[PDB]
Scaffold this active site. Structure first.
Site, PDB file in Angstrom:
ATOM      1  N   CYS A 174       0.801  -1.128  -0.123  1.00  0.00           N
ATOM      2  CA  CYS A 174      -0.066   0.123   0.139  1.00  0.00           C
ATOM      3  C   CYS A 174       0.861   1.221   0.098  1.00  0.00           C
ATOM      4  CB  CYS A 174      -0.879  -0.210   1.264  1.00  0.00           C
ATOM      5  SG  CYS A 174      -1.980   1.064   1.348  1.00  0.00           S
ATOM      6  N   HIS A 205     -10.321   1.148   2.466  1.00  0.00           N
ATOM      7  CA  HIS A 205      -9.559   2.383   3.125  1.00  0.00           C
ATOM      8  C   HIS A 205     -10.911   3.234   3.415  1.00  0.00           C
ATOM      9  CE1 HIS A 205      -5.410   2.111   2.551  1.00  0.00           C
ATOM     10  NE2 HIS A 205      -5.437   1.921   1.224  1.00  0.00           N
ATOM     11  N   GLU A 243      -9.165  -0.812  -2.255  1.00  0.00           N
ATOM     12  CA  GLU A 243      -9.255   0.765  -2.230  1.00  0.00           C
ATOM     13  C   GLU A 243     -10.630   0.869  -1.270  1.00  0.00           C
ATOM     14  OE1 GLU A 243      -6.743   2.163  -2.756  1.00  0.00           O
ATOM     15  OE2 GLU A 243      -5.743   0.636  -4.185  1.00  0.00           O
TER      16      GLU A 243
HETATM   17 FE   LIG Z   1      -3.749   1.058  -0.132  1.00  0.00          FE
END
Ligand SMILES: [Fe+3]
Length: 190
Positions: free
Chosen positions: A118, A165, A162
């Site tokens: 990441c 997140h 994603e």
């Molecule tokens: Fe990430």
């Protein structure tokens, strides 16, 4: 901030693990987006474009990525950009999504054999990150139109990373500390 494995934002604009914003649950946005929100999404995608260009990435010290979520640039809003370039078959993924949500989760699991990285994580954590091999996502695009995606394999993994997140979830939260590299029985290698 899925890594690539196959104002212009720079790496310092991407907050690092430990920053509180990465652990917050991001806000659903109302459409239409504000001008700032559109510019944000466009800049997130442009960062992925820049990070994927060998010369620009080298010139500005960018780490190559194929996904970025707004919380990673300290904006706690449900927006992501995914830019997975053509894999040689013509399949390419270039999506800037607002309020993406997984509505169908494939039972069969899939994982990247080398684990996941990441852009917000400098100290890598080993371990398989089991994800749904197939998913269906509903979201809005930058103009508030409706997008429904059916994804499988690597692209599915990237979008799950994603979207996580937006819920304050990092890839390593999925890592089994007891048997980190052991694939689940049903699981398939992406
Ligand atoms: Fe990430």
């Amino acid at each position: 901030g899925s890594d690539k494995i196959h104002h212009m934002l720079t790496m310092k604009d991407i907050i690092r693990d430990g920053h509180p914003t990465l652990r917050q649950k991001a806000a659903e946005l109302e459409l239409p987006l504000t001008k700032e929100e559109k510019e944000t999404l466009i800049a997130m995608r442009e960062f992925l474009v820049n990070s994927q260009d060998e010369e620009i990435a080298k010139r500005y010290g960018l780490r190559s990525g194929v996904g970025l979520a707004a919380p990673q640039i300290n904006i706690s809003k449900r927006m992501i950009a995914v830019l997975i370039p053509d894999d040689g078959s013509g399949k390419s993924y270039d999506y800037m999504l607002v309020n993406p949500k997984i509505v169908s989760h494939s039972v069969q699991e899939a994982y990247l054999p080398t684990g996941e990285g990441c852009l917000s994580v400098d100290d890598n954590v080993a371990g398989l990150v089991h994800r749904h091999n197939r998913i269906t996502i509903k979201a809005k695009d930058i103009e508030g139109n409706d997008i429904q995606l059916r994804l499988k394999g690597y692209p599915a993994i990237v979008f799950q990373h994603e979207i996580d997140h937006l819920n304050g979830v990092m890839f390593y939260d999925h890592i089994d500390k007891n048997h980190p590299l052991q694939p689940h029985t049903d699981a398939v290698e992406v």
